[PDB]
Every structure is written in structure tokens, then in C-alpha cells.
Amino acid sequence: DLSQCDREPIHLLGGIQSHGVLLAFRGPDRLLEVVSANAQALLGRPPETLLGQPVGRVLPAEVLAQWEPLVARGSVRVVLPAGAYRALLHESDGLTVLELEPAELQPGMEETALEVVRRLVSPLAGVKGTQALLQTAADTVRALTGFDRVMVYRFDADWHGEVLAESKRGGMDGFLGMHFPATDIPVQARALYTRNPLRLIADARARPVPLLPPVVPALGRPLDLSNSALRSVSPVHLEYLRNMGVGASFSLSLLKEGVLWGLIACHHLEPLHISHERRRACEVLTQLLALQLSAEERAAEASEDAHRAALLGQLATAMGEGGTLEEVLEKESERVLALTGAAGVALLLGEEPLLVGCTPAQDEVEALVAWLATQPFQTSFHTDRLGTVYPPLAARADVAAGILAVRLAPAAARFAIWFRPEVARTISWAGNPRKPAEPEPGHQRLHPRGSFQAWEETVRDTSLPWKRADLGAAEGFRGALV
């Protein structure tokens, strides 16, 4: 179900944010084709009068002088009689898009940000866990942006997420540890956040500035603002902000090894514009954490596969120390369990089933033993909520909430099945997950949930997720029984 949320084009709403001015040109003569209605407060004259006119007679000479560097570097600073603006330049719908927004005024900013990078690299980060690695990356970003609250938000495989870190001001509420639906950040949004990694909402109460003309004439549609720094956002999202009593919003995507792993959302309770220069420096921090997270993770996985392979070697040094099948896998009982972080093992070596640890009844292992043999897997099968696919043992989630089965022979149903009990998790949801929006009668005008107060849900009948190492240790064992 691709809902109403996952529909309307957020890149075709046709408004810009009032703290800036948008101009679009087409042609070798670069005649103004698309103008935002507030254009006058800079250009001088009625916007309607400057459509159809080449750049030379609409743009100030303060800016055209630096047009070449604008074209080559994509952005240049320009001082006007109004103040210091930053000219941004890109391409869209075959037209040239120009944006003026206020520039950075405080000149020891890059110095300051060069010092938050030293903190986020250091000799080495992630000392006592990646938790304080995200907590620093949150602190650094608050210190640089001046925002009252900064959360690290992670995405889960269902595309729901959780605040894993939070650096806020004293006397402020916090969303630490809470959980959030997938409809909160829809799919079309996550599609373009994985392309354009920044977004600033200076004033959520403010009214978007329309563009002129309302369509691109040669197209019958509005100008594609997917790469605009001043594009104004969906209306139903400005209300979700107001129902949190926030006033400004800045978010950066956390792209690590290709995918959208999460966001760094920044909340302020009064409007605040952050210079495009200050946001690029923040982007330098977010990429920094994303590289730290990657090197820490692989290192954990490597060390987690060296201890598992220490076990595989102890199994074999013993299994060859004496002819003793039934006996060693019994005398070395905890070295098999710990191979997959398991609590009971059922080994199908024909004959009878050698039951080790806490394990389901011999006539119940013989029940999944017969169903698994008619399941579509090749070498391994792992469920973390078995009861849902195999309900007969849905009441035995005390020993069989999750399973990890390996085939010890091609045909000839010969398996090694590790078992895990459930692990009960209470997740707190920021507001009711079942009514996470308010539709109006006719179900054609959705609104957001107005309460983000805790909602608690103990999760049952699920086990711990089978990590990557458990699974490799399983198939390593497999090449030692055949």
C-alpha cells in the first residue's frame, strides 16, 4: 500500500522560503523564465516586469562579475546594498536556477568547525562504544548550529526508527529512546533525501513564496525544485512541526555504505536561518561520523568472527582427540550452543536426535524436522519468530522462539538446529502507533497525530536477531560433520 502520504510530489509544490530569492533563466540570452514573487526586495522592480528579460537587465552587476566562479564552483558570495548574500547555482528542467540567501557573517566559523572535526576524529572515536560516538557527533552539531535539540535518528529494516542519541538544552523535553512510524518520513521523501542530503526550514509558521509563472510554460507543470536550497516543504509536515511546538528545523541524511541509515534532526523553538556555509560544515561532520561508524562496525564483526572461529577449532581439536560422536558434542556441549549464541541444540544424525541444552520435545523436534525438510532453503534456515511460520510450536517460545537450521547433507534430511527463546522488549512509541495520522471525513485530507507522548508496547514471541556471525559459525560447523 503506497498511501496518500507516499503520493503528492514534494518537488512540485512550487513555493520557496521567504528568507531568499529564486530566479530561473533559459536560453543563450538567459531570459528570466521563472521568478519568485518576493524578487523585488532584491532586484528592485516588480517581478512581473522582469520575466522575459535577459539576465543583464535584471541582475545586479554586483553578481554578474562573479558569474563565472558561480558556474564553475556552484556558489559564490555577493555583497548587495541589502547585505552579504550567497549565490547558489544548479540545473533543473533545462533551465538555470539561481538562489540568493543570506551568507555567513561571523568569520571565525570555519575555524570553529575545523575544531569540531578534530573532536569527531580524535586519536580514535568510539572508545566506550559507538553510543558516545553518536553522542559526540550530536554535541559537535549542536555546538556548530546553535540548535536547542539535536537527535541521532536510526532507520530499521521496516523503515521505522529510533532516537539513539540526543544533545539538547537544559529545561527542554527529549525524545531519547522513543520509536516512530514509517509514515512519519514517507518513501518519496526518503528517495530524494538519498540524493540531496540537506534541508533547512527556517520558520515553520511562515507562508511559502509562490513562483512565477505557476507552471513552466513549455511543460504544463511547476519547476522541479528537487535541488533547491530554499524549496518550501509539504504543508502537512509544517503542521507536524507546529504540533510539536517547534519553530525551525534542520536535518542531514546519514548515508554510510550506500543506504539511508538515518538522520540527524535538529530542533529549535524559534525561527533561525543557518547559512549554507554553516550547513556544508555540518555535512562534513555527518560524513565523518558515517565513516567512523563503518570502521567501528566492521572491526566489531571481525573480532566477533575470531572468537567464533576459536570455537570451531576447539571443537575439532577435541573431535579428533577420541572417537566419541554422541559423547564429545555432549562433553563439549556449551561450545556448540555458544557457536550461534543458542540455548538448545537438536542434532539430526539419523538414529535418534541428540538433544543438548534446553530443547523442544523429541516428538516436537521430529515435527519441525519433517516440515523443514519441505521448505525452500539450500544450506541454512533462520527464523526469529518461528511461531508465525510454524505455529505447532507457537506455544514453545520459551525454547523455540527462533531457530537456525543447517543441512548436513543434500537430500537425506540431516540437520543441526539451534534454538533461541524469546526476549521480551518494551519499546516506547512517541504517540499511539495505531492512530499515527488524523484523516478527515472522506479520508482525503490527512493530518498528523497531535500527541507524541509515550505509548508502551512489550514485544513478545520474537527472539534475538540471528547476526551474521552466528550464521557463519553455523555453516562452519557444517563442514565438520558431513
Ligand X SMILES: */C=C/C1=C(C)C(=O)N/C1=C\C1=NC(=C\c2[nH]c(/C=C3\NC(=O)C(C=C)=C3C)c(C)c2CCC(=O)O)/C(CCC(=O)O)=C1C
* Residue 236 contact among ligand X, a copy of itself, none, beta carbon within 5 to 8 Å by kind: ligand X
Q: Which of residues 400-429 bind a copy of itself (CB under 8 A)?
A: 408-410
Of 100-108, 123-131, 245-253, 371-379: span binding ligand X (CB under 6 A): 245-253
| Cβ distance to ligand X smaller for residue 55 or 201 | 201
Nearer to ligand X, 245 or 313 (CB): 245
Three-state SS at 368: helix
Cell of 267: 530542533
- Residue number, 183 or 275, with CB nearest to ligand X: 183
- Exactly one of 109, 132, 236, 284 binds ligand X (CB under 6 A); that residue is 236
Looking at 38, 145, 251, 463, which residue binds ligand X (CB under 6 A)? 251
Among 37, 309, 358, 437, binds a copy of itself (CB under 8 A): 309
- Is 453 a binding residue for a copy of itself by CB under 8 A? The answer is no
x/- map, 270-289, a copy of itself, by CB under 8 A? ----------xx--x--xx-
One of 12, 71, 84, 114 touching a copy of itself (CB under 8 A): 114
Cα separation, 177 vs 168, in Å, equals 14
Spell out the residues 6+ positions from residue 288 whose beta carbon is closer than 8 angstroms to its own: 117, 120, 121, 137
Contacts for 134-140: CB closer than 8 Å, 24+ residues apart = 134/164, 134/165, 134/289, 135/165, 135/167, 137/165, 137/264, 137/285, 137/286, 137/288, 137/289, 138/165, 138/166, 138/167, 138/264, 139/167, 140/116, 140/285
Contact between 289 and ligand X per CB under 6 A: no
Asked whether position 446 contacts ligand X by CB under 6 A, the answer is yes
**152 belongs to the binding site for ligand X (CB under 6 A):** no
Q: Which helix (H) or strand (E) holds 97?
A: strand 95-102
The 3-state secondary structure of 305-364 reads HHHHHHHHHHHHHHHCCCCCHHHHHHHCHHHHHCCCCCCEEEEECCCCEEEEECCCCHHH
> Binding to ligand X by residue 233, rule CB under 6 A?
yes
Conformational region of residue 97, where left means phi above 0, alpha means psi within -120 to 50, and beta covers everything else: beta
Q: Which helix (H) or strand (E) holds 140?
A: helix 131-145
What is the residue type of 272?
Answer: L
Burial label, 387 (beta-carbon count in 10 A; 0-12, 13-18, 19+): buried
Nearest distance from C-beta of residue 78 to a copy of itself, angstroms:
16
Binding site for a copy of itself (CB under 8 A): 107-108, 110-111, 113-114, 117-118, 121-124, 255, 258, 280-281, 284, 287-288, 290-292, 294-295, 298-299, 301-302, 305, 309, 312-313, 315-317, 319-321, 379, 408-410, 472, 475-476, 478-480, 482
* Binding positions for ligand X, rule: CB under 6 A: 5, 8, 10, 180, 183-186, 189, 199, 201, 233-234, 236-237, 240-241, 244, 246, 249, 251, 263, 265, 267, 436-437, 446, 448
